[PDB]
Amino acid sequence: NPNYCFAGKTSSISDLKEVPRKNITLIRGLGAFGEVYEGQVPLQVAVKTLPEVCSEQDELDFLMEALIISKFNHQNIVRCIGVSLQSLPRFILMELMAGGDLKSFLRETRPRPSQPSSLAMLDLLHVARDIACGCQYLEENHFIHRDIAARNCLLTCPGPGRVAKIADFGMARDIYRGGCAMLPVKWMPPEAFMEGIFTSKTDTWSFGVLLWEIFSLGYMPYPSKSNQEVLEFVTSGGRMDPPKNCPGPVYRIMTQCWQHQPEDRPNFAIILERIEYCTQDPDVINTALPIEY
Ligand SMILES: C[C@@H](Oc1cc(-c2cnn(C3CCNCC3)c2)cnc1N)c1c(Cl)ccc(F)c1Cl
Numbered sequence: 588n589p590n591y592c593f594a595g596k597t598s599s600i601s602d603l604k605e606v607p608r609k610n611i612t613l614i615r616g617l618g619a620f621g622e623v624y625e626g627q628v629p630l631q632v633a634v635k636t637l638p639e640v641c642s643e644q645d646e647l648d649f650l651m652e653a654l655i656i657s658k659f660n661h662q663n664i665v666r667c668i669g670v671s672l673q674s675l676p677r678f679i680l681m682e683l684m685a686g687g688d689l690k691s692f693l694r695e696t697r698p699r700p701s702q703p704s705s706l707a708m709l710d711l712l713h714v715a716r717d718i719a720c721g722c723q724y725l726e727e728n729h730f731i732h733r734d735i736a737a738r739n740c741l742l743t744c745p746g747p748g749r750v751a752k753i754a755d756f757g758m759a760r761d762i763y764r765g766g767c768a769m770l771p772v773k774w775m776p777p778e779a780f781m782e783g784i785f786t787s788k789t790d791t792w793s794f795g796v797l798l799w800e801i802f803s804l805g806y807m808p809y810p811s812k813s814n815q816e817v818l819e820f821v822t823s824g825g826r827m828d829p830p831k832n833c834p835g836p837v838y839r840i841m842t843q844c845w846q847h848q849p850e851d852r853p854n855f856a857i858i859l860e861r862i863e864y865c866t867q868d869p870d871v872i873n874t875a876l877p878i879e880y
């Protein structure tokens with residue numbers, strides 16, 4: 588059985604908290620490879636399933652993601668409640684994030700003449716800060732996520748007390764041990780997609796793109812551009828324009844995250860300070876978000 592090392596220590600399948608299957612009830616589906624359910628163990632949970640029709644590599648991938656998430660301990664990384672690996676289909680049990688993924692949330696919660704005040708600049712800044720805090724924890728523990736993006740973040744709830752958390756660690760799992768068309772090239776810095784070089788500054792670039800996703804309210808990055816067009820665009824120095832109504836101080840964080848040389852990009856401590864300073868600036872947080880008609 589394969590081992591996993593994080594923050595100094597090594598763990599194995601034996602270290603995962605096995606929850607007796609009889610104690611697990613599935614309630615409803617929550618919408619690729621394997622299904623997700625709302626469940627109860629009472630403790631409410633999200634259940635990620637491994638299809639019984641899978642390869643040996645699939646099994647090991649499933650095991651590795653369980654190990655990875657179980658070994659993190661931070662408020663902005665989704666918790667793993669445990670696993671049920673001794674029955675089929677196999678389960679990973681996660682903290683239930685009723686807000687759903689960040690991309691879907693932003694698109695369905697965009698200000699509307701029906702809901703003119705569904706979201707404000709401060710809400711977006713708080714989400715950005717939440718994820719940045721999660722990224723800082725990963726960075727200080729020498730973990731490179733490789734796929735920081737809105738689709739991979741979850742929210743505790745739709746309402747005002749919401750907390751955003753990094754949730755999907757599939758890319759990191761894959762690399763820890765595929766194809767060009769599945770690579771998240773629109774979130775990747777030049778040295779990543781060209782040389783396959785990944786560092787903490789990789790996640791900084793991706794976080795810049797996430798920031799754009801957030802302040803665009805859930806648009807796909809590089810509108811109208813294909814993966815290869817983005818690759819050539821970014822390699823040549825091209826960068827995205829500010830999202831609609833984006834305050835200048837916020838856009839400047841994005842452009843710093845997208846510096847061509849990794850050494851010129853901020854670490855997450857600095858990104859956090861700059862997000863904090865934005866939340867303090869009345870001219871930033873008093874800026875109205877566009878209302879979608
Ligand atoms: C594996 C799966 O886990 C969860 C999904 C969800 C989820 C997905 N969708 N929804 C909706 C349920 C109905 N109300 C709106 C959100 C909740 C909540 N908690 C989870 N732990 C998941 C999904 Cl499905 C998408 C992105 C992620 F980063 C993750 Cl980690």
